[PDB]
Each structure stands twice: as C-alpha cells, then as structure tokens.
Amino acid sequence: TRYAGKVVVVTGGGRGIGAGIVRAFVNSGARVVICDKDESGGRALEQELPGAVFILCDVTQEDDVKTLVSETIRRFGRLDCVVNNAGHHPPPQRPEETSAQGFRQLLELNLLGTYTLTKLALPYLRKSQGNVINISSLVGAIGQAQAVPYVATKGAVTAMTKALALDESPYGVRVNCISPGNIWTPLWEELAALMPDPRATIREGMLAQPLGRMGQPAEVGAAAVFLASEANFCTGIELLVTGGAELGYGCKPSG
Amino acid sequence: TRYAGKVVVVTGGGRGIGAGIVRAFVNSGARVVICDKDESGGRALEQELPGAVFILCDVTQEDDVKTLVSETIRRFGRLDCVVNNAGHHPPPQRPEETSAQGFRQLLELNLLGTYTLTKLALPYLRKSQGNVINISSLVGAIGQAQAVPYVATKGAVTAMTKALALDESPYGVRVNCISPGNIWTPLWEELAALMPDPRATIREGMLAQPLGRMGQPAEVGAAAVFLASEANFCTGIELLVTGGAELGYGCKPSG
Amino acid sequence: TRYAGKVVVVTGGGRGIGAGIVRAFVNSGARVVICDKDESGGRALEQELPGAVFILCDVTQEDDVKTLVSETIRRFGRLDCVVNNAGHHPPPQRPEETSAQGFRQLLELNLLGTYTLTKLALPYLRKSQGNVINISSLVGAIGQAQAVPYVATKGAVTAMTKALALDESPYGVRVNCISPGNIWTPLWEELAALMPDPRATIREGMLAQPLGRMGQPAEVGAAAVFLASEANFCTGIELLVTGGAELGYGCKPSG
Amino acid sequence: TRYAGKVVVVTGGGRGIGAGIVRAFVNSGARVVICDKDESGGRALEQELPGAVFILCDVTQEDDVKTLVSETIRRFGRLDCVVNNAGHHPPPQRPEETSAQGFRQLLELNLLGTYTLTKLALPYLRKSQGNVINISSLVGAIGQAQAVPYVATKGAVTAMTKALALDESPYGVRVNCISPGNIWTPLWEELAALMPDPRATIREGMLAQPLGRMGQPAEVGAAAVFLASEANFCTGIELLVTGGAELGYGCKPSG
C-alpha cells in the first residue's frame, strides 16, 4: 500500500526494465498503464497483473502519446507518476560508422519521446503533486565505447531531468532519473548474441561490476517506487543502480 | 515488514536525523540499537518505541564502540545494518579562525568514529550479508562557506564510502552514503540561534532549495530504509536528499 | 610558440567566446580557420589577425562542413585541433512553451553540428595526433531554469565528449570539453536586453559567481590553448571555466 | 615568461610529481622554493635549476612550515602560489588491516599539512592576489581498492579546496586542485616493487588508462602552471590529469 490509490504510466513496459517497474508499482498498490510499441509482452502482462492495463503507443508519435494521456485520465481519473523507460541501445558502432541520420532517430526515441510524454502529462501531475522518473544510463555520466549516439542521448536525459526539476519545483512536481548499469534484459541478450563470442561478452558484463553480477529489472523497479512514493525531498537527482561499476580502476611506462 | 527480523545500529540516534532514522527502521519491522553520547533523547526514544533500545556510546571512544557492538550481538544475535549518523557542524568559522586542533577533533567525530564502528561491525555484517549507510553531506560535494574543517570531513566520508564498497563487494556487504542538504533538526536550530538574525538565517536556509522548504529527519530515514532493504544492486552510491539545492545558479561586468 | 606550426578550426569564431578562442590560438603561433555562418565579425577578424582566415560555414549544413574541412586541408596541409564552439541559447522559456520542433532545431546546432565537423575532421586529426575541444556549458551538469532544450543539448555534448574520447584514445586523438559559466558575450548582452530589467539581469549574472564578475572570452581561449597544447594526458575531461558558480548554496520550515 | 616575477612554494618538491611541478614553474620564469622533508633530491634540484632553492621542511611540523613561509618572504619579498603536493600512498591494505593510528598519521600528512601551509601563506597570497593548488587524486572521486585511509584523505582535500575557494573568493585568491591518476614516479615504482609480480602491477597500471600509458610529472606540472598563470576565472575546480581512467566500463547472470 506504499503507493495505493495512485496511477502510473510506464513507457516501454512490455519487457525488460519497464516490465520490472510495472510489477513493482502494481505490488505497491498502484494502477499501472503499460505503454509499449509492441503488443506481445505488454498484453500478456495486462492479463497477468490485476491493476495493470496495456495501451499500444509509440512514444515517437505525438498523437500516440496524446491518446495515451487522455485514455489514462478517461479510464482512471488522475495521473501521479510517469516513468519514461522506453529507449534503445544500437549495436556497438565505431564513430566513423555512425550517421547523423541514425543519431537523429535515436534522439527521437531516447530523448524526445521522454520530452513529449512529460510535457503532455505535466498539467495532470501538477494537479496530483505527482512526479516524473526518467530512465537514463550510467554511461551518460562516464561514457561507453562504440556508442557515441547512445551516450549523447543519455547525457541529455540526465541533464534535462535537472532542468525540468528546477522549472517544476514551484508547483510541487518532482523530476528525477535512475541511471542503471548492466541490467540483464532482452536487449542485453540480443546485443550479446550479435557479438562473435556472446558468452565472453556476458562474462565481461557481469564482471564490470564489483558485485560480480548484472542487475535485475526488479531492482530498478524498487528504486522507481522509492522515488515515487518515499523520496519527497528528492528532485533532480540521478539515482545510480549499477552494482558499483563506476567505482575504482579497471581495464580500459609513461611514454 | 520490509526489514523484519533485522538488527540495526544508528549512531547519534537520540535526536535529529538519527532519531528519524531510528523511527523509520522500527516502522520497517527492524530492531534498533540507538547509540548516543547523550542519554536524554535516546532514553526517551527507547521508552517510546517497542523494538528500540538505547546504549550510551561516544563513537570517538574505541572501547565504547567495542562494547556497543558486543552488546548488540549479545542481546539480539545478529547485526544487519550500521548507520553512521553521529556528527557535528561547528559554528561558522572563517578559515583564519580555524585551528589544526579543532580540525583534528572534528575528524575524530565525523570521520574516525564512522571508521571505527564500521571496522568493528564488519565481521558480523559479512555473516548477515548486511550493509553500511554513512550520513555525509551535500557540502562535501559542492563546498560551503565558513566551514573548511566540516566540508573536509564530509568529503572524506563520501570518498571512504566508495573505497570500502570496493573492498567489501566480494563479501556481499554493500556500503552507501546519504548526503542530506538543509534538514530541520536541533543542530540547525542551535546554529541559527547564534546568528545575529536567526529568522533571516532560517529563511535563507529554506530558500536555498528549489522546493522552498528544508527537509525532515523522516525523509532521510526513508532513504536509509531504502538503501538497507531494497537497494540490493547499489553499492558506493551517494544518495542526495537535498531538495535540489545543488541544481542551477543562485546568489553566491567581466572585469 | 606554444602551438606553432599547428592548424586550428574554430566554429562560431566571429564573435563572443569563439573570437576569444581564435585570438588565443593566433597568439600561440597557430594558423586559425574562423568558421561562422555570419560574415560580419569573422571577416573583420581575418583582416585584423595575420594567421587567421575566414570561411563562411553553417555547421548545420553537411556540405558546408565538408567544404570547411577540405578547404582547410587544401590551404594549410594539415589539421591539428577542432574547437566546436558554435551554439546558441534561446530566450528563457517555460517547459510548456517549448516545442519538439524548437528542440530538434537546437539539437541540430548545439549537438549535431559538433558531431558532424568532428566526424569529418577525425581522419586528419588521426594523422596529426590532434585533438577535439567541445564548448559545452556548466548548466549541462547542474541544470538551469527556463532552458530545458538548451540544458539537454549541453548534457549531450559533455557525454558525447567522453564517449568519443574512449573511441579515439587508441589512435592518439584526445577529446575534451570546456564548460563555461556566465561569460560576457554578445549573446549574454542580447538575452539580457529582452528581460524587463536588463540591468538587474546582468547584476544577478555577475553575482552568481563567487568571484563576483562574469568571465571573458580570453579566459575560455586560454583554457582551450591549454587543452590543445599542454594537456597531453587529459582526455574526456570537462574543464570548468565558471568563476565558482557551481560551489556552495545560493538563492534557488520543513513543511 | 608566463609567470615571470612570481614566487612559488612546492611541497614535496624533491622528486616525483613535485619535482615536475618545480621544473615547470622554473621554466615559466618563476622563482621556486622547493620544500621537502628529505634533502637528497631537493638539494640536487637547487644546484641544477637557477631560480629554485631548497628549504628543508616537514609539512607535518607546524614550526617547520612557519619557517618555510617566513624564509620565503625574507628571501624573495612576496608569495604568489602554494602547491600542496607532499603526500603519501601506503602499501595496499585490506580494511581490517588498517588502524585508526595509521589513519590519523596519513591525515596529518595528506590533509593537515596542506591545511597548515595554506593557512600560514594566505595573508601573503591575499596581498599578491595569488592562488593555491592542491594535489589530490582521482581516487578521492571514484575510490580505490585496499586504500580506505588514502582515499578518505584525498576526498577531504578535494572537498576542502572547494570550501576554501568560497571563503577566499572575496579577496581575489583562487583555490584549485589537480587530481592525477597513475603517474610514473618513485612512489609508483616503490609500491610496485612490493607486489608479488611487479611487472604485472605496472602493466595493469599502464592499461588502466584509455591512453595506454601512465602520466608524467611534467604533465602535472603543466596543469599547475596553467592553474597559476592563465586560469583567472577558475576557482574550486578539480582538474583531472588521468589519461581517461575514470571513463567507461572496465574489469572491477543477474543472480
């Protein structure tokens, strides 16, 4: 009952981190709207979880998002939290193999879809003194190899979170982000499968954390429920859920 | 029941932030040992809260801390979390008015008392796969005026948290810190009373946050319970509980 | 003679910070290509400074940038440093007054123009073991009010700098950014003139820094020459040129 | 002639990073006072470098430091820059192998010696509008394994730098720090020699940086000369001289 009576929208909620967040909010007593561009996972989740419903919505399509917000209000009467989780990591790409075109397309999803939903939701969040939770990434803060466009988009989300926190603070709306590290998800599995040695890639990924494992969607979900329900003096923070990957020296005489 | 069956030690738990943390852990189902160098507040808290007991202990005195740990194990059979909250902010002091002597004394409390309890507790935390929560400060990260020794001590705590997180990760013990901003406590009230205009000082303190108020001990307590009970992929993080004070430009042509 | 025999391209070099950077590199013995979308300032600078030449180039237009690079190589035979300074701050804008359209246009200048020039220059920088210097902003790191799109773009540049530093390190090309704070420039003057009280706006801007003044283009220029010519073990850093604005509490009881 | 007519004190200037800083300031036209607790290296440096003189001084001994300052003023008539470089890294030590005693001794050198010299020098730095440069470490920011006391001391120095920058800004005295990463020095050589495989230790140390080598004292020296002589709008900054060690994922599935 930590978040009972509340209404939450989770984008990209059909699988992976987003599905873990959906489950965490349902478990906290909230009603959850699962937004996803794919039907397969999110429709099954709706059947599985009382309190969760699925709405097909591509966050890059403004009219899709407008309908997502109006349908949430029509069906549930209020909106307390938006979790902007929908996003993508392309395969590893050397800088010279990237294009301005692919960069623009990745900005549309990872950055502008978060911007658009937040904008359309904020009038309702103001009425409820609700909050925004953006899913960024550790690599926005520390960088990553072969990922110039992805890193750029996540630096933008983390920065935007702080700007919007300033703008919305007079109105009682908090705006925070979570920066996960390596979380075992279908995306992590798909990218590893492209590598010449997928098992070596996964092993490297587990060992990049001092804790020696990857994180779970449920752990990101718990951090999101904390930020929504108990972090009433937190705004503009970047909550790291990384297993300590950013700490210390690793594998990355003076001549 | 988020932290039921667990045993928590909170230093400086008799008033202020520490008392808020005690209450939060009791409310989460834990048994709490209140450590304080003063009897007044902590003894009353023990009478008030089933599940909390008071042990007189000055964290600067090594034999006091040794007894704190052995008595916790003797009475409760396990130790899951140590919250190093005991600390002090001296009155505002210009750099030239500070002394190496006062600096050493403040390091003894704010830094070495945290080091000592952590050291003595870690064998038991390893057995329980428990965790350490240090209470640092925002000003360790961004600085503060008229507070060179205090700032120095909190930079040390935040850094130490990350070092110890690395060392203890192979053993399953997480080590994190909370960095509060302005929290309304008896210390905040005492320092404001020394200023020529205490009401102006408090007003400035509320307005240093975009949220426009100071934080509450209960909000720091919630962040501590999160870190203990639900943050299983977080180690070496600095969780900011500041109301957004670190964001944006404030009151701090090119000639 | 700190950077004698070297060839530097500075985008947005016709006025403001960019012109200060041009002058600093000329003073260091380099030959400088001034890129700007406007002729007025950059053409005068070319007449004033032996060693500087002006090339009309809008960094948002890919064929303009391709010509900038090929003309630099045709005229000077090498390329050692690219300074991506061209950028813009829109007038203050509440979140609900921004548009996805304006956001995309600002990303084209502040982020993708930097990406495009860097990409086209990197083959030549590899041959010279040269370097990239991006001009980001403090507010990418700490946020700013009424500036969600601008902040987002500068978070992206700072993050991108770190990603590209990783990718280019095996090839000996360093990639760094400078994050200025309030620098007195024609843009600062133009924005202040829109405010209801321009003099109050400028006064607030001087006092946002502990040093009590705004910075000068020449001070950003010196930091750029340092990064190019003497910082041979620095890559992926964010060099702050802010007068201390990010330090301490300012103007931004627990109920 | 970048720093001609100026007087600089460098602590721990007899070898390693400190000697590189001495040489850089001499090369910039300054007169340099080499402070060291050991005579061997610093006396030879005085014979080698016109413009440098050696004064025996243990920064942990307050009367030694008082004499250092008074002798600098007696001999040269002014004081423009203090570089607090003296410091030590103990051998790798597991947390349970450290002592409060060793921790206090390391704080005396790495933190309080910097505090003491700065305090005694500041009246003269105010007269000259001079500046303070503290040599901290990257690991104060990101942590390090088997080094809890060392990390703690460097977190303190970096934090203290920001506090003092705030306090001294009204008086025109800037206060900055440099955070080196792995720099090839006699200390690095001594510690590697203790390890079971010294060559593996050095190899790991070179490869912890994306640039693939360790840094040189001369590179830290250049950053110090920049901060003294050209960074007139920088105060309270942490200048990283690390070869990119803090960037990206390294060597540090969800169960």
Ligand SMILES: NC(=O)c1ccc[n+]([C@@H]2O[C@H](COP(=O)([O-])OP(=O)(O)OC[C@H]3O[C@@H](n4cnc5c(N)ncnc54)[C@H](O)[C@@H]3O)[C@@H](O)[C@H]2O)c1
């Ligand atoms: N997995 C990790 O290690 C990791 C680490 C850091 C950050 N993240 C971030 O977490 C988020 C989730 O990643 P994941 O690993 O769970 O990915 P995933 O690919 O497993 O799941 C993403 C979900 O979002 C949906 N989605 C994609 N594009 C969409 C669109 N236009 N509109 C609506 N829904 C859309 C997908 O259909 C999918 O259900 C992303 O923002 C990612 O950048 C992931």
Ligand SMILES: NC(=O)c1ccc[n+]([C@@H]2O[C@H](COP(=O)([O-])OP(=O)(O)OC[C@H]3O[C@@H](n4cnc5c(N)ncnc54)[C@H](O)[C@@H]3O)[C@@H](O)[C@H]2O)c1
């Ligand atoms: N109040 C704030 O705005 C603020 C902000 C950031 C960080 N903090 C930190 O939070 C912690 C608590 O501060 P507070 O405002 O609640 O202070 P407080 O003075 O109100 O309470 C501190 C408690 O610690 C106890 N204590 C002091 N020295 C001790 C010792 N040697 N051994 C055992 N107990 C001891 C005191 O008796 C008291 O009960 C401190 O570490 C402080 O630095 C406070």
Ligand SMILES: NC(=O)c1ccc[n+]([C@@H]2O[C@H](COP(=O)([O-])OP(=O)(O)OC[C@H]3O[C@@H](n4cnc5c(N)ncnc54)[C@H](O)[C@@H]3O)[C@@H](O)[C@H]2O)c1
């Ligand atoms: N002035 C500050 O306080 C401040 C603070 C932090 C960062 N910055 C950054 O510094 C940079 C310079 O800012 P400024 O204050 O000197 O601005 P300015 O407006 O005074 O000068 C910018 C220059 O860039 C040129 N330019 C603009 N769009 C261009 C394009 N498409 N192609 C080529 N040239 C183009 C302009 O014509 C102008 O000559 C920007 O990236 C800005 O974000 C400025």
Ligand SMILES: NC(=O)c1ccc[n+]([C@@H]2O[C@H](COP(=O)([O-])OP(=O)(O)OC[C@H]3O[C@@H](n4cnc5c(N)ncnc54)[C@H](O)[C@@H]3O)[C@@H](O)[C@H]2O)c1
């Ligand atoms: N070498 C690195 O990789 C590295 C990395 C980051 C930071 N640092 C820091 O750089 C500084 C210099 O380190 P280094 O590697 O050059 O060390 P070093 O041991 O090679 O040289 C240190 C010098 O300081 C002197 N010194 C020691 N104690 C002193 C005292 N009490 N009073 C006066 N002089 C004293 C020594 O005699 C020696 O000449 C230290 O603060 C260290 O923490 C070094």
Ligand SMILES: O=C(c1ccc(F)c(O)c1)c1cccc(-c2ccc(O)c(O)c2)n1
């Ligand atoms: O999606 C991934 C990811 C990994 C970590 C993150 F912090 C993040 O935001 C995203 C992921 C999954 C599997 C492999 C990789 C990866 C591996 C090597 C690379 O060079 C790369 O750019 C990405 N990234």
Ligand SMILES: O=C(c1ccc(F)c(O)c1)c1cccc(-c2ccc(O)c(O)c2)n1
């Ligand atoms: O204890 C205080 C405090 C305030 C903020 C913190 F982040 C913190 O760690 C401690 C506090 C309370 C009341 C006034 C002040 C204060 C005001 C002006 C000063 O110059 C100063 O050094 C401290 N600090």
Ligand SMILES: O=C(c1ccc(F)c(O)c1)c1cccc(-c2ccc(O)c(O)c2)n1
């Ligand atoms: O260009 C400006 C600027 C100022 C500071 C920066 F760090 C930066 O990257 C850009 C600037 C100049 C004059 C006024 C303002 C400004 C004032 C109030 C605002 O709310 C705002 O968004 C911007 N910004």
Ligand SMILES: O=C(c1ccc(F)c(O)c1)c1cccc(-c2ccc(O)c(O)c2)n1
């Ligand atoms: O002095 C060293 C050092 C290395 C890096 C730093 F950033 C720093 O401030 C100091 C150094 C030199 C050689 C080996 C080591 C080292 C290696 C393994 C360790 O576990 C450790 O604590 C230190 N540190």
Ligand SMILES: OC[C@H]1O[C@H](O)[C@H](O)[C@@H](O)[C@@H]1O
């Ligand atoms: O596909 C990789 C992983 O994705 C998500 O974490 C799923 O919850 C988990 O069951 C699966 O193993």
Ligand SMILES: OC[C@H]1O[C@H](O)[C@H](O)[C@@H](O)[C@@H]1O
């Ligand atoms: O003394 C200041 C404040 O300290 C703590 O926050 C107490 O819980 C609160 O009741 C009091 O107002």
Ligand SMILES: OC[C@H]1O[C@H](O)[C@H](O)[C@@H](O)[C@@H]1O
């Ligand atoms: O227009 C504001 C300022 O812009 C730049 O800093 C110019 O160099 C300076 O002369 C002018 O005062």
Ligand SMILES: OC[C@H]1O[C@H](O)[C@H](O)[C@@H](O)[C@@H]1O
């Ligand atoms: O002892 C290791 C190194 O220390 C310093 O860097 C010296 O300048 C260098 O000559 C030596 O190789």
Ligand code: NA
């Ligand atoms: Na359902």
Ligand code: NA
């Ligand atoms: Na009790």
Ligand code: NA
């Ligand atoms: Na010319």
Ligand code: NA
């Ligand atoms: Na000499």
